[PDB]
Amino acid sequence: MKILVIEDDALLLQGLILAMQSEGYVCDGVSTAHEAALSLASNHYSLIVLDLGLPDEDGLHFLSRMRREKMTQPVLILTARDTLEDRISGLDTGADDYLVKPFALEELNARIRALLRRHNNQGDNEISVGNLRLNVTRRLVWLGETALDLTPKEYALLSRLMMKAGSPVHREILYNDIYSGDNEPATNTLEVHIHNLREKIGKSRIRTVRGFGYMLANN
Amino acid sequence: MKILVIEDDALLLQGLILAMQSEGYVCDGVSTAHEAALSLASNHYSLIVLDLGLPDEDGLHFLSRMRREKMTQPVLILTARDTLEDRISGLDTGADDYLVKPFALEELNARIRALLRRHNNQGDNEISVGNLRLNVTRRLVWLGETALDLTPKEYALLSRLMMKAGSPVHREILYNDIYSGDNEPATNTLEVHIHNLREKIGKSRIRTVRGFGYMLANN
DNA sequence: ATTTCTTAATATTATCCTAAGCAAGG
DNA sequence: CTTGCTTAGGATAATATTAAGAAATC
Ligand code: BEF
Ligand code: BEF
Ligand SMILES: [Mg+2]
Ligand SMILES: [Mg+2]
């Protein structure tokens, strides 16, 4: 990923850039709030490091702005201010960790590591075949791109046939996918709800499997 | 927004629990790894807090199993084991922060407030859906120009609804979000309380999704 | 001494099922 | 001639809506 580092001390700033590289992050770094602003506006950064002791504009105000400016990225603070209130206020200004100087480098490498692992998979499990985009995580389906009203039975069938889409699903799989245990119905609802899915205005992407079951369209 | 607090020092444990409540979270404190684990199975937690010094099993061991079983929950260790080898080893295991004992409950409130600012929504408050301004730190919701008089459960429910806004939030979520452990109510609590949020002007901004929980709408 | 929560007992649907006839697969 | 399709008022289980008397909370 791409880290940006921010340090008023030059010897330090280089030491960091180089360290962040030893670990293998593509890394830029700067000694000015202004330049930090220009580089943020320039590139994409997965993580920021900071100092509150910036010479041009105070770091806290820069963070205040950065998120006020609706740039939301993880921001680690690495600072000389170990005052309790400083930890507090920083952490409350949108700062996702606070590391006091003097510090050990392997710690900073770990805190950054953890911050990034959390940042890393925010990914939503998704399945889209055709117009349909099924969101396993959001429980949102889209005949692309529009809302799909789905009763729980409808959604269960759609996602079972979406997950297996294109290779015919056997009838018993779909039946059980709907009513658990004592809930088992006597007649003709598999067909009723398959009918309803087909009636979504999405033009029958279900092909009927003659022997047993039903299948979904592919391309 | 219901925390689990895991500790084996009694006095401290009750204190933490009562403190977490004191901020407006809801909490289940436990004394050990098995209790913790079973408590993971049953309920749904916004954040957990961990101790390594448990008599049961070592907090880390549990964190390895937890996070290896793909429990994506944000952990925050807090322990009496301060060595740098300890914190790096803890973080890599791993936890989304670590804080050493002793400490000010205020640093803990700050790091947690932050950690959740990260997890649930991205970056910073305020989450704003439609005209509603929801500020995580200030505990206040605003409808357009004005504010709302929101009961605690009202604020928490609307909070979890705006966090996930645009997506239907399952019932069990809002439930576990409101009620801590022993305080689980037996009747109608959801629908009534939601009926009150709804009756607070802005209806209908909450779509009931049958078979599921309730969704918020931004368009 | 207000304010906020929980309990029922209520009233209102949304979603599933009831078959029973009509389409075809084969 | 067996297997899937379509048709709805009508049963079911889910949420809505109350109003009052518990708890909290001041
Ligand atoms: F002066 Be900075 F906080 F390192
Ligand atoms: F005793 Be525990 F590790 F704080
Ligand atoms: Mg400085
Ligand atoms: Mg301990």
Author numbering:
A (entry chain B), B (entry chain A): 1 to 219
Give passages from the manuscript.
The PmrA–26-bp DNA crystal has only one copy of the protein–DNA complex (complex-3) packed in a different space group, P3121. R.m.s.d. values between the three complex structures decreased to 0.6–1.0 Å with the PmrA-2 DBD excluded. Complex-2 and complex-3 feature similar interactions between the two DBDs, with interfaces of 303.7 and 284.1 Å2, respectively. The interface interactions identified in the three complexes are also similar. Similar crystal structures are obtained from two crystals of distinct shapes and space groups, growing with different lengths of DNA in different conditions, which rules out the possibility of a crystal packing effect.
The response regulator PmrA, which belongs to the OmpR/PhoB family, functions as a transcription factor.
